[PDB]
Design a binder for this molecule. Structure first.
Ligand SMILES: [NH3+]CCc1ccccc1
Lengths: 49, 327, 273, 231, 230
């Protein structure tokens, strides 16, 4: 358990703003191309009924 | 004082919250989704899992029944009766060849869909766990990872039928696990209000996340591969990061009392949609915790969710045995 | 005098169409109100709605005129319509009573014994038999057979008229049978509920309400219906009209009693609203 | 369904959907029961009387063309909090106690209280058993047992006049002390939604199955009498 | 898995004959069945059809009342009854399984067969009849359709069989693009909607045979002519 705690504490960390920047960059990169966020035109989707 | 040192390091590494960073982005105003089918099992439904072709899906019910649907034309393809009448989780292979099931028992069953005969038969009966199985997922056509009720996870080998690695360290029983996109590491949350990260290569725990009020009900992994989200019975949804080692912004509302049952992301990572006991499946903005969309239509507890691989549809199943494909 | 009667009428008609329609709408768009013992109320509500809309306005057309504007063969069908729907409603009442008997007689073998097949058969019978025998009685002219002079004189006097032979049978096959089953069933259920309650008094209230409503609504009508043939037709028609409207009033009182007095449907309706 | 293959696909789907009707017909006319006991309680003897790291075991018995499934949870973890949610549709919970140890009773009382007060398990009737009577009588009439030391209030007891025994006033007094101790927890709360049905069973009584049958019937009856406000 | 067929022989004209297809090695009650006829000097021809639960039965336009089809699940036997047979019905008969669901592989396993000696439908044609080949060259076979086989959903219902000289026909490509199970990963197929082609990259001594073209877009199942390779 002591060795496990030492291994846990041995890791390094990064700033919490770079992670937010990466997440928002990925979100804005892939936001417009997928149906859930941007409503697909009714011709493309297979669920029309 | 290792815990105190870790807490001090985490506090030092913290500079700002997600609200301050994300306040400079225009929010998503409103998202409205409506049904496009009702896939209609005798008892309640306890799990479901989308196929890799984004067309098929598999559902498991307390009757002791697995049904493989056809989400486009509503038809049924396969109906498998289980040997045990109590099943809690089912999994669909990434290659569309096998399925796996496991409930309150000490067994994981493997059914081989593609045979020379026009019937499905069990090909592997994985035994060796002590408590009830609460999650099972595939890595490929040869390796399967299970999380059980005896506070353990196990990585198996279907070909030989014997365990290959055992993951231990959780005090309470683990509920659900999610796999990383590269199938190298994974995460697993337990009832001890803690989620631990496991590495397959050496079979040892590498990271821990704690500080959540109650036991963990469901967990999901961010599409990027370096973040994840959890939902529990304390009416709170949490987000965590791997490298930052921080508990990031929480999606909660003051008018919610019951507990989350399942949490799933979106393909783009912009929306977090999670079920509840109050017959609903709420939708939150992943960066502002703004309630944008309520998906009503169920008359009982919501037990499963899931967004298809290409993101066209999301299917929800509840305790009245009605699967609904939202859109 | 005419205005008050007309107002009370339109009130009653607006009542029967509204309440029974709602007992059709509420049980139509819901999925937890689709039990095999909730389609009988559906059929009863449809019967009451049809009865109201097709028959009551013409009853007011007849009300004070003392004579029918419409045709001599355009009245014949109205009578057969009226000798069908009341019988259908009463039969549905009896079948509901039988279902409620099987609810607390052998509670273990309930689900297996009264699946949807039996309910559909009961609806089909309760809807086919009255239609057949009402049309046969009202179009074959078999109710005044051998009594042409009396029928002609009574019609000239100024119509639903029965002879000695056939009046017995209508009363006998459309009220006594129903009375003999619902009453005995609810007496047995009273005994069972009283003994269970004593082991551990709401049993009296519901049964008293149901049976009192049914009896006060129907029994005088058929009592006079069989009294008149055996006497010299001395009963004034001003009592016959009131008896007809008691019979009609039963139909508008039915859906309130059955569909609403029970909490589960009340909560379903409240959630729908 | 315009194409040729899609018609065979839809007919296969329909034929799949017409085997579920038979399963539903079988599943509606079957009563489910949940069995709980302890380590020393003779649940194994009972389940053998009606008729390998596994977790659940199956038992079936039929009386008068009535079918009962009896789910007995086997070798699991000591905590029953999380897998109890699956058993909120059962007809009744059979609970088993061995009244022959004089010390392994307080834990039994707390287990019974936990079962009674579980909010998932509310509105589920509890059938209750007592096992190993004969051992109880043997340990009662052989002396050297400090029953009053274990239960200080045992000494000042008077058999309810309702007793119907069928030999030793002290033995019956202790028996009804145990019975009333179990009944106190059930009578403390409940609000008239679920009931308890205590009994007195020997090691192997052939009548046992019939017993359950009767109890089950009563429960269902009361449920109906409340669904109609006719109780 | 194997299917054994019995019956046939020498029958006088106007008689009645019964042919039996016995199945042993799979779930016979979950499979639709067909019957395919091949003349001694001509190609294949579809004869009848029967569904899994006998809920739907089709028939050929050439013969409609002369042939009766039946199945027996508990004994797992398929019966074909012929009465008032003419001189044309003197060909080889083949017993064919087929299972239809999303992603299935119809028309895969063929029986051995038993000998017998006494309009608006879409027609399909083959350009060639016989070409010379060498062990190692590339081979292309062309098939032409009288109508566009592509459907609204997207499926292109066409099949290639490629029997061998002395054995029962097999399955190579189903739905114009999907490879079969046991065939080696060197065959290929392509098309545009009306004309289709099949390509073989390598060539071995086992590839000698006759290549066949089939359509499955409407009720009739019409074949091609054949393309022998030497
Ligand atoms: N409102 C009159 C209804 C009726 C009259 C006679 C027989 C049956 C029914």
């Amino acid at each position: 358990l002591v060795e496990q705690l030492k291994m846990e504490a041995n890791i390094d960390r990064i700033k919490v703003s770079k992670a937010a920047a990466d997440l928002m960059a990925y979100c804005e990169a892939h936001a417009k191309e997928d149906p859930l966020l941007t409503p697909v035109p009714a011709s493309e989707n297979p669920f029309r009924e | 004082q290792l815990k105190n040192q870790i807490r001090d390091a985490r506090k030092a590494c913290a500079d700002a919250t997600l609200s301050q960073i994300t306040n400079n982005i225009d929010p998503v105003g409103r998202i409205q989704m409506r049904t496009r089918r009702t896939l209609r099992h005798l008892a309640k439904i306890y799990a479901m899992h989308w196929g890799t072709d984004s067309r098929l899906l598999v559902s498991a019910s307390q009757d002791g029944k697995l049904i493989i649907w056809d989400s486009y034309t509503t038809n049924k393809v396969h109906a498998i009766p289980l040997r045990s009448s109590w099943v809690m989780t089912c999994a669909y292979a990434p290659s569309g060849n096998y399925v796996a099931c496991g409930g309150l028992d000490n067994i994981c069953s493997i059914y081989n869909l593609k045979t020379r005969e026009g019937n499905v038969r069990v090909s592997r009966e994985l035994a060796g766990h002590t408590g009830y199985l609460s999650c099972c997922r595939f890595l490929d056509d040869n390796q399967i990872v299970t999380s059980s009720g005896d506070t353990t996870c196990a990585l198996w080998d279907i070909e030989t039928g014997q365990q290959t690695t055992t993951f231990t360290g959780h005090t309470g029983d683990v509920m659900s696990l999610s796999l990383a996109p590269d199938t190298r590491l994974f995460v697993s949350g337990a009832c001890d209000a803690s989620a631990k990260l496991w590495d397959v290569r050496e079979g040892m725990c590498r990271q821990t996340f704690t500080g959540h009020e109650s036991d963990i009900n469901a967990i999901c992994f961010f599409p990027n591969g370096n973040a994840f989200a959890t939902g529990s019975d304390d009416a709170t949804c949490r987000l965590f990061d791997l490298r930052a080692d921080q508990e990031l912004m929480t999606y909660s509302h003051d008018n919610i009392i019951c507990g989350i049952t399942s949490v799933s992301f979106s393909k783009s990572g912009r929306l977090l949609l999670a079920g509840y006991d109050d017959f609903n499946c709420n939708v939150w903005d992943a960066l502002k915790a703004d309630r944008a969309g309520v998906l009503a239509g169920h008359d009982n507890r919501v037990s499963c969710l899931g967004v298809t691989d290409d993101g066209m549809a999301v299917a929800t199943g509840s305790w009245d045995s009605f699967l609904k494909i939202w859109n | 005098v005419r205005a008050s009667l007309y107002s009370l009428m339109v009130l009653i008609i607006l009542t029967t169409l509204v309440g029974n329609l709602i007992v059709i709408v509420s049980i139509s768009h819901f999925k937890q109100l689709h039990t095999p013992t909730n389609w009988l109320i559906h059929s009863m509500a449809t019967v009451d709605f049809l009865l109201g809309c097709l028959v009551m306005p013409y009853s007011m057309v007849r009300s004070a005129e003392h004579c029918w504007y419409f045709g001599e063969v355009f009245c014949k069908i109205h009578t057969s319509t009226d000798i069908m729907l009341s019988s259908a409603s009463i039969f549905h009442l009896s079948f509901i009573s039988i279902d409620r008997y099987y609810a607390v007689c052998d509670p273990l073998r309930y689900k297996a014994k009264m699946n949807i097949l039996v309910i559909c058969v009961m609806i089909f019978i309760s809807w086919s038999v009255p239609a057949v025998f009402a049309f046969g009685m009202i179009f074959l002219e078999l109710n005044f057979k051998g009594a042409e002079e009396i029928y002609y004189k009574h019609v000239h006097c100024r119509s639903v008229f029965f002879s000695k032979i056939s009046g017995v049978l209508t009363f006998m096959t459309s009220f006594y049978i129903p009375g003999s089953i619902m009453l005995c069933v609810y007496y047995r259920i009273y005994l069972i509920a009283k003994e269970q309650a004593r082991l551990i008094r709401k049993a009296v209230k519901t049964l008293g309400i149901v049976m009192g409503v049914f009896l006060i609504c129907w029994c005088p009508f058929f009592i006079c219906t069989v009294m008149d043939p055996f006497l010299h037709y001395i009963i004034p028609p001003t009592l016959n009209d009131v008896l007809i409207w008691f019979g009609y009033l039963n139909s508008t009182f039915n859906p309130m009693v059955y569909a609403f007095f029970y909490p589960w449907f009340r909560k379903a309706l409240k959630m729908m609203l | 369904t315009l194409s040729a293959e899609d018609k065979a696909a839809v007919e296969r789907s329909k034929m799949i959907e017409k085997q579920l009707q038979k399963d539903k017909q079988v599943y509606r006319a079957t009563h489910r029961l949940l069995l709980l006991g302890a380590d020393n309680s003779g649940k194994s003897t009972i389940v053998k009387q009606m008729r390998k790291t596994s977790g659940i075991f199956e038992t079936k018995f039929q009386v008068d063309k009535v079918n009962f499934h009896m789910f007995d949870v086997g070798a699991q973890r000591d905590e029953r909090r999380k897998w109890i949610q699956c058993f909120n549709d059962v007809t009744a919970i059979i609970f088993v106690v061995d009244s022959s140890d004089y010390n392994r009773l307080q834990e039994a009382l707390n287990d019974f209280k936990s079962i009674w007060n579980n909010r998932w398990l509310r509105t589920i009737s509890v059938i209750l058993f007592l096992n190993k009577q004969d051992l109880l009588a043997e340990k009662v009439l052989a002396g050297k047992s400090k029953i009053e030391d274990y239960f200080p209030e045992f000494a000042r007891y008077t058999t309810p006049e309702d007793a119907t025994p069928e030999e030793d006033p002290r033995v019956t007094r202790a028996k009804y002390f145990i019975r009333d101790e179990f009944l106190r927890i059930s009578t403390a709360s409940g609000d008239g939604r679920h009931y308890c049905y205590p009994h007195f069973t020997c090691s192997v009584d052939t009548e046992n199955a019939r017993r359950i049958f009767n109890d089950c019937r009563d429960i269902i009856q009361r449920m109906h009498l409340r669904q109609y406000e006719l109780l | 898995v194997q299917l054994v067929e019995s019956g046939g022989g020498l029958v006088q004209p106007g008689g009645s004959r019964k042919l039996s297809c016995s199945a042993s090695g799979f779930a016979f009650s979950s499979f639709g069945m067909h019957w395919v006829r091949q003349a001694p000097e001509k190609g294949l021809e579809w004869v009848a059809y029967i569904s899994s639960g006998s809920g739907t039965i089709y028939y050929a336009d050439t013969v409609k009342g002369r042939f009766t089809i039946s199945r027996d699940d508990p004994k797992n036997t398929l019966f074909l009854q012929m009465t008032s047979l003419r001189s044309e019905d003197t060909a080889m008969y083949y017993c064919v399984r087929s299972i239809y669901y999303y992603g299935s592989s119809p028309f895969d396993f063929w029986g051995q067969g038993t000998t017998l000696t006494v309009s608006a439908d879409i027609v399909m044609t083959q350009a060639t009849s016989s070409v010379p080949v060498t062990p190692g060259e590339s081979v292309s076979i062309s098939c032409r359709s009288s109508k566009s086989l592509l459907h609204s959903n997207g499926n292109t219902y066409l099949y290639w069989f490629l029997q061998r000289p002395g054995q029962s026909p097999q399955l190579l490509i189903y739905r114009m693009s999907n490879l079969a199970s046991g065939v080696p990963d060197r065959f290929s197929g392509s098309g545009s909607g009306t004309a289709f082609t099949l390509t073989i990259s390598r060539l071995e001594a086992e590839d000698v045979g006759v290549y066949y073209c089939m359509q499955h877009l409407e009720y009739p199942l019409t074949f091609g002519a054949g393309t022998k390779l030497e």
